[PDB]
Amino acid sequence: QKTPQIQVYSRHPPENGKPNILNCYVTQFHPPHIEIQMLKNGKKIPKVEMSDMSFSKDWSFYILAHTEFTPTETDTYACRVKHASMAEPKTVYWDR
């Protein structure tokens, strides 16, 4: 049993009011059953693309979530993960 690491990053340099993509890469977890949500000001973003699940040389799973977004000055973004290795959901905020 293994705890997911979560990293959040934009595809392009963030300019306010310019379209961009926000990525949430979740790694190092086991077992493969996992829920990933991306959040805008604490609400779930509905249209989120997921890559196929895969795994590394060390057998730990990984998967990429991404979504279209255009940043602003006041909007805050996060990626929240529910997994059986954690009694609580882990949330990682986008750095900016």
């Binding site: 990293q7 595809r11 392009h12 699940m53 990429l64 991404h66």
Partner: protein, 273 residues
């Protein structure tokens, strides 16, 4: 120098629930997916069939379809043979394929993990448990090594088919595999874990292929405090990476991030703080 790997992920939650999903990678590009939901393997590239004819592909796919159904029932029957030592939920992973060297040389591999831990491989002409594998596997592995038809098939796949197929992929997928995408870089800061410090961050994104150089600089002096992070995939088959430098307050001035990449052809990106 490419590694072709077919990855299978099988989950068994109880006697009535299981799914098996696969993905195939040639280096860092995905060539196939095979969801539990589809009868057929799906291509994720225009060149995913390699140089094989539709006849050869159908025959290969057909064998995997047989295999997936047989795998699923074999494992669930093996649960009841060794219960209640190890009960549900059960996770199995297979990683199989070949490493392609220059001069038309290759090494093939077939590795299996149980509950996230390497336990079995195919080697030469037989399946074998690895040292430290649980001893209840020794009998099931003998049962399987008695199936000489499976053994000959797996031997064909590893010795002939795998390097054959991959030679074709490399030819047919040349322009994607040899693609060059240019990095775009930008600078920012985030809080440091130490007091009176700021963490300078140099972000580099959209580059392909993977190899890249990124350093914080003060003139020609490389800043040995540069902490390079992991390669993180973008969703468009390019790479993302960031390098950080924790610096005292006031000492930021004069710093620069410098990026080298094969797609820039000597023309390094240099950003200044």
């Amino acid at each position: 120098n490419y590694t072709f790997r077919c990855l299978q992920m099988s989950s068994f939650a109880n006697r009535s629930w299981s799914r098996t999903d696969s993905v195939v990678w040639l280096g860092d590009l995905q060539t196939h997916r095979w969801s539990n939901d589809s009868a057929t393997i799906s291509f994720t590239k225009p060149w995913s069939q390699g140089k094989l004819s539709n006849q050869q592909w159908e025959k290969l796919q057909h064998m995997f379809q047989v295999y997936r159904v047989s795998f699923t029932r074999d494992i669930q029957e093996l649960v009841k043979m060794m219960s209640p030592k190890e009960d549900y939920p059960i996770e199995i992973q297979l990683s199989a394929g070949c490493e392609m060297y220059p001069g038309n040389a290759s090494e093939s591999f077939l590795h299996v993990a149980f509950q996230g831990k390497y336990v079995v491989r195919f080697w030469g002409t037989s399946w074998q448990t690895v040292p430290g594998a649980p001893s209840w596997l020794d009998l099931p592995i003998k049962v399987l090594n008695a199936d000489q038809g499976t053994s000959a098939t797996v031997q064909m796949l590893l010795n002939d088919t795998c390097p054959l197929f991959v030679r074709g992929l490399l030819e047919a997928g040349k322009s994607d595999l040899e693609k060059q995408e240019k990095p775009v870089a930008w600078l920012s800061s985030v809080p440091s874990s130490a007091h009176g410090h700021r963490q300078l961050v140099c972000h580099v994104s959209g580059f392909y292929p993977k190899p890249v150089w990124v350093m914080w600089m003060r003139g020609d002096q490389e800043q040995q405090g540069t902490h390079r992070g992991d390669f993180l995939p973008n969703a468009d088959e390019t790479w993302y990476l960031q390098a950080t430098l924790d610096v005292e307050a006031g000492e930021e001035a004069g710093l620069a991030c410098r990026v080298k990449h094969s797609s820039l052809g000597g023309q390094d990106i240099i950003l200044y703080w």
